[PDB]
């Protein structure tokens, strides 16, 4: 079937898109930064919120383009609780515990599969509780996932390049536990269950109306 | 319970061991020993109280509380009553005969 | 009939039991010693709730609704990790000249969005003592409240589709009692009892109460909960 | 050697045990249900007492000396009839350049006559907390006091003839420890814990402490008591 949970969520789809320019006044526009979460894609958010607990591996493939030699790009995954860079170049990119891919253009897209990382036994899409105890509702640190920072590798002298990074994401080997009823209201936040009440269904006219 | 046959409701019959204050609220009378008597399914509930002694005070208590009022359908009396019966079991023992203090010459 | 269950507290009752997901409460089967307390198993009867013509629903967060109960609520003060399943008996008393329908449902990990989007609320806006909270027919519009619109369940989902969770229907012209035995469901083996609410219980009346003239103007609903198979972390040194 | 006894409280020690009257503490073997509490068995160590050149004796009433102790002292608040034996370990720490003798003795039902004949005294004139009372060398002559003359033991008997009760001698140049296991002795099976004092413990120094120069000026005495085989009246309904 195509109705298995595995194939239902097995699809791959775009989840983040951003640009950076090598030479820019801002130093936060010289590299990509991206907390990994599945609450930014409205379409796929609803499919992962029909379950209360999920357990999966991730597969992330990047499609990079550039506009004005061979251009190389580092792609660094930072596992949760690792150092995070705050500059285009600093010691956080020289860390040996943060996986990296040095990919050049004109080759098949970069890809890596991040395993199930969590000290719990499943991720939780819904958490009803507090972190410290009564900026704390509905957030726990067990469902936290890493970050991805790109940054164009270049010499000691930078040169103007504008690049666009697209990230594709695919759940893999999914298991799912405890159904939920599908979402009815539109999402108003990216990290809250906040909503505005909506009608149950679209009105008819009379109870005996059955016209096509 | 000697009310109508159409009445329903509940009661919480609590028990306090000897040397312990009677409960002051329904809430803390439910943390002792208790029986939820439903008068919709039963018409009689029996307790057997241990530790009864001459005490010549410290004594147990049996209290009863409202749990979910009393509910009746249309055309039924608005008042009912509860009767109570008491007797020894069979573990009683009596010693030293003496005159009753309910007779005056 | 009458099964006349006892544990140190006697409840006479009786539909049939609806076991959660087909899993009964069970003990977890070193450097984590653990040890169960088997003296916490016994009924705790919460205060009666008046179902009237007005009322539109109710809810209770667990295990924060048994926090003030003797012994069970005192193990939450000592031990800092715990677990436990539950047995919940919701039962009404009504005549044959009353009518109504209820949906008893246990929703695990029910997050509730606030009223007024992007606003934080206190922890006394959904849990406090053993007090029953209340849904409102019209949309909430108060700064320090949870969105309590009844037709969204306070979660932005269909209210008709809450039959996807352990549930039973108390239709007054058929039965008058429901029992749900909920097991422990969480993503970790044990968790702190005050920082997390495992599930919520809800009673939602579809079909409003009606009762003609000169009859009782309310039907009481009585919730009774006994924890089953509770277990806590050990407090003694290892060898 | 060292026996290293444990119960949830570990005491390393070691003379030999002196069992009361040759009877070990034992459970009492209806309309009186009863039930024991086996979680009260564990050592409770009373505060150290300084034996100096001045001091002439000490005493403690039981079971009013364990009234503030956790659990054992809380069963006295609930259950209104109880019983229990005891295991008492009195032990000193001293050098070989100290000298002294002590008499550890347990006197059952020791009445004490007041100071100033025909005068009543309070119940804080001989028992209060776990505090150790003190005998005086000279005759007491205070209205609200027990007669505390040491050579009469506060009962008008020879102090030398108190070796007729369970006892052991701590002679500092030989041993330094004593153990007495007292059984429950009363004329009824169970009795109220606050209206009666089953026995008293006494430490009486014959031969005063002496220790030459530039040595510690006191020897500490440490009493440790664990109740054995405690049993109380049931609090639940019969069938």
UniProtKB/Swiss-Prot annotation, chain A:
Subcellular location: Virion; Host cytoplasm
Transmembrane segments: none
Quaternary data: Interacts with capsid protein VP0, and capsid protein VP3 to form heterotrimeric protomers. Five protomers subsequently associate to form pentamers which serve as building blocks for the capsid. Interacts with capsid protein VP2, capsid protein VP3 and capsid protein VP4 following cleavage of capsid protein VP0. Interacts with host integrin heterodimer ITGAV/ITGB6.
Function in brief: Forms an icosahedral capsid of pseudo T=3 symmetry with capsid proteins VP2 and VP3. The capsid is 300 Angstroms in diameter, composed of 60 copies of each capsid protein and enclosing the viral positive strand RNA genome. Capsid protein VP1 mainly forms the vertices of the capsid. Capsid protein VP1 interacts with host integrin ITGAV/ITGB6 to provide virion attachment to target host cells. This attachment induces virion internalization. Tyrosine kinases are probably involved in the entry process. After binding to its receptor, the capsid undergoes conformational changes.
Name of this protein: Capsid protein VP1
Organism of derivation: Coxsackievirus A9 (strain Griggs)
Organism lineage string: Viruses, Riboviria, Orthornavirae, Pisuviricota, Pisoniviricetes
Complete-protein stretch covered: 628 to 851 of 2201
